[PDB]
Each structure stands twice: as C-alpha cells, then as structure tokens.
C-alpha cells in the first residue's frame, strides 16, 4: 500500500538510479536475478512499495527509464543489477538534444513523450493506493532538464492530488562541465517551482568536498557520489517500508516542512560518515549523530547554512534508540543555536524514529532542512545567466527551434522574484 | 509556362524581378561601353552594353531565383 513509482531521465538521473536500485535491492536481499535470499521476515512485508510481482516468483522494479539517446541505457543494462529493469520500460530516441533545452522540450521531447507517458499511465493506474512519484534528473543537461520538467507538468495535470518528489542536481560554478549550463538551469527552475511538491538540490561540488574532507579517500569517482546520493534517497522513505515508533510518510513531511506553497527547496545530508581508518575509533551515540547532522560541511549543497536562518528542520533517525534522548538532543540543538532559527515559528524541528537500521550500520540519520541560505545558489545562477544573456551569446541555438527571448525574460524575472520572496521571510520579525 | 513555373517554384523559395536599372558613376569614360552583370549564388544575367554617359538606363526584366541567401 501507499507505494510510489520511479521515473528517471537523462544520463545523470540514470546513473543515480543505477545505484539507488542496487542499494534498495541489497537492503531487501534481492539478488541481481530477482530472487529473494533475505534473512528477516520484515524484508518482505512491505516489498510492494518499490517492487512488482511476476510469475515465477521474481521481482521487478516499477521504474521508467527515458533518454533522448540510447547509449546510457544500453550501458546501464550491462552493469550489476541491470537485468531487474523490465525491457518494455526502456524508451529512447535516435537523435538526442545536445544539451539544448529547446530541443529537449519543444521539438524532440514533445513527440517522444507520448510513449513514455503511456507506460507511466499504465504503471500508475494499476497500483493499489498511489502515494506519489519521485523524479531524478539533472539541471545541467538539455534533454534531462527539458523532458523531465515537461513530464512533471504533464503528470501534475493528471494527478493534482498526489505528491511529487524531485531530486535535482543544479550546475555549480566551481565544477563546470558545460558552457550552456546557466541557460537550461534558469529555464528549468522556472517550470520546477510551479509543479513540484518537493525539490531537493544536490551539488557535485559539495559531494567532492565531503568525499575529500570527511571520508578522506584519495580518488573520488562518480560511484561514490552516486552511493552517497543513493543512501540519502533511501533514508527518506525508510519508515514507510519498516515499522517504527513514529511512522511518517512523505505527505507528513510535506505538511510539516513547507510553510508556504512556493518554498519547497530543501538541502539534505546524511550521517554518520567516517573514514575507513577511523571507523573503529568512533562510538555511535545520538549526540555523535546529531552533532554531525547539523554540521555545515555535511550538507549535500555548497550553500552555507550559517549564512541564514532555518525556517524548519526534519530528522529521520534509524535503529533502535530511546525517544527521550532524541527529543532532549533536538531541544538542545535548538537552544544553543537560537540565532540561526527563525523566531516567529516555535518548535520548528520534526523527528521520527525507525527501528530498522541500514545494513551494516547500527544507527543512521537523514536530515532535511528548509533554510533561507539556499538563496545564494539562485543568486549566482542568475548572475551567470544575466552575464551571458546581455550579449545574446549562444541564443541563436535556442531561438532557431521556436523559442524566443520573451520566455527568457519571464524566466529571469520569476526566478529573481522567487529569490526576493524567499529572503523576505528571513528579515521578517514578530 | 505553367509546368516551367511549377518546376521553378519547386526548386526555389522566392524570386526577385529587377527592372529599370539606372547606373550613375562619379566618372564615365565617354568612349567606353558599360554593362551590368546581375548575379547571385544560382546564376547571372547581363544587360546590353550602353555608351558611357552621366546616367545610363538599362532596360530589361531580370528574374533572380533564391534558395537561401537573398543577396
């Protein structure tokens, strides 16, 4: 019951899913052949959340994979746990977008999306009670940031009451791999605010910083960043698949973390994270988890959370632990940092406990906090956008496929209005 | 004429008809003849040569067919 379907688009989203599904399968004891080989009874009670049942007793994820080029899905199939995905759900084009947002949203993405919407509708109509959808995509690419966001609007138009999740990677100015990143980032943020019920920003720069400083491993690769993102993704829905002292589905988090409908851009972090050589030194206790949870360097975004004030915060503890300690520590982390918490909403931290810890760990915490410090990312994105747009650089590529500069002006104005009205509440006082 | 026009309209995106060409130069040689060569990427037309004078008037209808650049 109350299950969700997985939809991913683009190369970055496909690579994120290729590790997210591996993590989920390892958590539920599903072999790469789709056969259950788990140890505990609880591993099968709520498997309908992510997995479907077919004849022969094997399980198949309800994931939908879409891209405008076939290479990435032809590569993910040969990887581990690549056989679980149903071949029918693979939809792809023969041309690609070339990191051009217009091509992936107006000319090419519009004709292809009917086929993927057909299978999306097939998956949603069938399921017992829908909880919602979760979306993984990147804002630094053309086909992803175009087709995914248009699909968001199409899904929202047909299921207005369901919940919608988006895990979005925004292009940081530090590690830049594409010159046209500001254009399709700014165009995508315009559409994303209007339809997504929840959005979670993730930055490659913050992932590299975490890998270099906390884990202290010499050579980070995309596999480590994907693993961290996958652990963070799994931590959110853990209590929906396992029993606990205070169950809290996604809708309950939506109620408690979004004060106003347009303020739904969160930054997350996962604890504990320790190096291989120091994993024996540390002792896992609730104070040790909560001190690392609120650490500024532990956030999955380069945004500095002590440059603003938290509107609200959430924590999803895992493992068996006493609730009194959790509540007193949450109170203590809020009394010692009163300057960084907005004062006109008292008791702005939500907590939840799940009795099933991750495989290999005795305690774990997932942190989701809505803070005013996120304005800095939109500020720098808009700064680069307005630095590049004033000369109409690279504009002809977009304008040759039916798009105009008016949609750029409206997007810039709406993004600046969002930036302004997000900080409006930072200076608000009672 | 209809089939030729249909073949022309199938090959080209537009036509420009140029008429009444008046040449004025800062200096003419009185003993020299002048003609205009009207050209695009698809072909060229030539006027009849006329004797040099302070203004020369070349008569003719010059149909210039385009497939891209309108120069």
């Amino acid at each position: 019951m109350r299950e969700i379907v997985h939809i991913q688009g683009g190369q970055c989203g496909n690579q994120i899913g290729a590790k997210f599904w591996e993590v989920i399968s390892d958590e539920h004891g599903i072999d790469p052949t789709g056969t259950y080989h788990g140890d505990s009874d609880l591993q099968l009670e709520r498997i309908n959340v992510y997995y479907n049942e077919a004849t022969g007793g094997r399980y198949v994820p309800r994931a939908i994979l879409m891209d405008l080029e076939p290479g990435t899905m032809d590569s993910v199939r040969a990887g581990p746990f690549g056989q679980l995905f149903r071949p029918d759900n693979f939809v792809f084009g023969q041309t690609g977008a070339g990191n051009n947002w217009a091509k992936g949203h107006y000319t090419e993405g519009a004709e292809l999306i009917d086929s993927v919407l057909d299978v999306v509708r097939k998956e949603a109509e069938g399921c017992d009670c829908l909880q919602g959808f979760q979306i993984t995509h990147s804002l630094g690419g053309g086909t992803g940031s175009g087709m995914g966001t248009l699909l968001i609007s199409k899904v929202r138009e047909e299921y207005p009451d369901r919940i919608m999740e988006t895990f979005s990677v925004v292009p940081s100015p530090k590690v830049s791999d594409t010159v046209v990143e500001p254009y399709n980032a700014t165009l995508s943020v315009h559409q994303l605010v209007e339809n997504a019920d929840e959005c979670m920003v993730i930055d490659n720069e913050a992932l590299y910083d975490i890998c270099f400083r906390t884990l202290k491993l010499t050579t980070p690769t995309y596999g480590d960043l994907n693993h961290l993102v996958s652990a963070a993704m799994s931590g959110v829905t853990c209590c929906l698949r396992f029993p606990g002292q205070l169950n809290s589905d996604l809708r309950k988090l939506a109620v408690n973390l979004i004060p106003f409908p347009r303020l739904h851009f969160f930054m997350i972090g996962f604890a504990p994270l320790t190096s291989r050589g120091s994993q024996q030194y540390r002792a896992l206790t609730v104070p040790e988890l909560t001190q690392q949870m609120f650490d500024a360097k532990n956030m999955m975004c380069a945004a500095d959370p002590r440059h603003g004030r938290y509107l609200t915060a959430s924590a999803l503890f895992r493992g068996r632990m006493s609730t009194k300690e959790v509540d007193e520590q949450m109170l203590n982390v809020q009394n010692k940092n009163s300057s960084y918490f907005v004062e006109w909403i008292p008791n702005n931290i939500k907590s939840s406990i799940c009795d099933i810890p991750p495989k290999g760990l005795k305690m774990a915490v997932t942190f989701v906090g809505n803070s005013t410090a996120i304005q800095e990312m939109f500020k720098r994105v808009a700064e680069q956008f307005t630095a590049m747009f004033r000369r109409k650089a690279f504009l002809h590529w977009y304008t040759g496929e039916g798009m105009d500069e008016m949609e750029f002006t409206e997007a810039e104005s709406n993004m600046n209005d969002l930036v302004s009205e997000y900080q409006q509440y930072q200076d608000a006082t009672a | 004429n209809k089939e030729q026009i249909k073949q022309i309209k199938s090959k080209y995106e537009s036509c420009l008809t140029v008429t009444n060409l008046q040449l004025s130069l800062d200096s003419f040689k009185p003993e020299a003849y002048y003609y205009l060569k009207i050209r695009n990427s698809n072909g060229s037309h030539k006027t009849t040569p006329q004797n040099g004078g302070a203004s020369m008037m070349f008569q003719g209808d010059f149909d210039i067919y385009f497939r891209g650049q309108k120069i």
Partner: protein, 430 residues
Amino acid sequence: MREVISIHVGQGGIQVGNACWELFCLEHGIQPDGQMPDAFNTFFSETGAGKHVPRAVFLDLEPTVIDEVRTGTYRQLFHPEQLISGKEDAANNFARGHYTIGKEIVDLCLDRIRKLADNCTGLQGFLVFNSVGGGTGSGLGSLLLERLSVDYGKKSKLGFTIYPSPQVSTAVVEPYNSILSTHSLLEHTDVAVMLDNEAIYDICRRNLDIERPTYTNLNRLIAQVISSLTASLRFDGALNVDITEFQTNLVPYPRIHFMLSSYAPIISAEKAYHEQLSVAEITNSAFEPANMMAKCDPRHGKYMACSMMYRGDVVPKDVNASIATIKTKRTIQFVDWCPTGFKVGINYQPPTVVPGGDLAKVMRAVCMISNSTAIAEVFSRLDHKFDLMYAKRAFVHWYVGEGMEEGEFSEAREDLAALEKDYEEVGIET
C-alpha cells in the same frame, strides 16, 4: 545506432585520411584485410559475414594518390567504387575545381553519399578533410558543402581545414583560393578547426625531438586528435559528449565557429616514463601557447569557450582541481560575458599506439578544442597577402578564363572585412 561519414578530398585530405584509417582499424582490432581475426558501428558497417567496410569516400581529380591507395596493403579494405578519381587535375586553380571539372564529378560523389546515408539509421553528422591551399581540394570541398547544405539541411558538418602558415608556403597563389574557400565555408560549415603546418612542425621539433619530419608525422598527430574527439561515441565514459552537443557550447554566434586545437601529452618512449604524467601537468601543458596546433598566440586575445576532452583513468575531482588552477592564473583571461567557459568530457579508453610511430603509450591524455578571439590575426595576415597581389590584378587571368566573374574576388574581401569587424565587436566588454 550512431554513425558518422568522413569525406576526404584532395591530396592532403587523402593523405590524412590514410593516417586516420590506420589508427581506427588498429584501435578496433580490424586487420588491414578488413577481417577480424559493438563499438565498430560508428565508423564501419557489417557486411553480414566477415569483412567491415569504412564509412568513408575518397575524392581527387588527379589519379596518382588514389592509385597508390588501391595498390597498398589496404587495397582490400575500401569498396572499389567509392574511390572516385578524375583524369585532369585542377592545378591549384580554384575556378577549375568549382566551375569546370568538379561539376562533372560531383554528381557521382553525391550518389555515393546517398548510398552510404541510406544504410545509416542514427547519422550523427559528416566529417570533411581538405587542404585549403589547393585547387581541387578547396573547390570540391566548397561545392560538396554547398550541395550537402541543401540536400540534407540541418545535419551537422565538421571541417578540418589546413590553412597556410604565416610565412612558410609551398605555392605562390594559395592566398587567393584560401580566401575564396573561407568565403564559401563561412556560411556553410558548422565547425572549422585550424591546422596549419608550421605549428605542428614546431611541436614535433620541440617535443618529439625529430629534426627531419615528413607529412606522415603530422598526419599521425591529426589522426590522434580526431580519435580523441570521436572516442566518446564508441566507448563507455563517465561524462559523455556528442557531436550535436557543440554548437550549444562552443559557438556563441552563428558566424563565429573557427577555433584552434591543442593536444597533450606529446612525448617519446625514451623519456616518457621518467615522469608521472599527472593530470594537472598535462592540462597545464595543453594550455601552453607554444603547444597550440595552429600558429596563433592565445595571449593576444580573450577566450570565449573551452571544450576539452580527457581519456584514460582520470578522475573528475582531479579535473576540477586543475580547472580551478587555470582560472587562477593571471596570464589567461576569459571574456566578460562568460563566467564559466569549460566543458569537460571524461572517457575510460586510453589512447592507442601505432607501431613504428612517434608517440609512446600513456594512460592519460587531454585534447582541447578552444574558441578564442585571437584567431583574427590569421585572417588579417591572409587579407594583407591577398591585397598585395590583387592591387595589380596579378594571376587573375588564370581565374577569369575558367568561368569565374571579375567581381567574385571583391565580395570575399568584404566578407573577410565583416568577419574581422565582428570579431572585434564581440571581444569588447560591456
């Protein structure tokens, strides 16, 4: 399901095509007979049982080079009737190969192009190679580009032209046809890469330590650059780049698409292994002005956008840590309206070595394609060379008597003046 077709016209084009086609056959394990004793599909096609046929066509009016090809070790590889050959050479006369003898040959080439294109299903684009300072090369390249631009339309075409050196020259009349061909491909080619011989001679002398190089050594380096550019289409990589993802990242405006390339490392086996060849040092060497593949000084102008490809065991974090260092340096400055200008690609397959060649085997390499404002100097010097002889109308009778009009020389001069004004207008800050 992704394909590309390479066009070779003229003596220089055929001699660099031979150079790239030993390298591709060696890299995909195909013997010179065409027989193997799913990545080949980008350049080759399967015949059903046994041999592979290249997706390439060789053009020339002068039969000597084609006859040399049809008797060498590669006689069995190419299809017998795609090596189109003429009888009479254009003899460095541009008007000949554009108006007199090229027209009767161009129809067969277009028929061959159609017969090759109907086989491909996912055609990415075309590649073309031609030495600019020759009659048949420049003239037939211009005519083929003009026919293809209307037969196919929006398909992407890439041109690896070899402009004459600043002072070193083999002919005496090459500025005329160089200017005319630049006129022709200015409005007809999506990408043009600079390849003059003097810079590559200096590269060989300084790094490879060869004091008597021949054309084969130059062509092998060009072939390596081509392989590095197209590796991302036929090998798995952490950060892929497609051909269609260029005009959205390197071409700010439709007129400006001339850029100059560089490669690193270039080193011989006698002293290669004594140093570690870290990613930082190779990416520093790639940006050195003395390692430009065209004899132009980047210190004389701004950068617009840099697209640079890695291959081997490089890790993205090391790439970011090196892009930061380059942004730090005061001798390299980017244009004002471009905050980020780097597009990064990472591939896993290390560069392959050709036996008996110059380059050694290494695990890391970098190839950069950079668009800079300093390129206007070559246009200015070619224009100055052209004006000297066009003042007295020298050598014009060799062109007027081959069907070309008198005024055709002036409009190429006007287009070059327009291009030079445009390059100055773009490079000024706001």
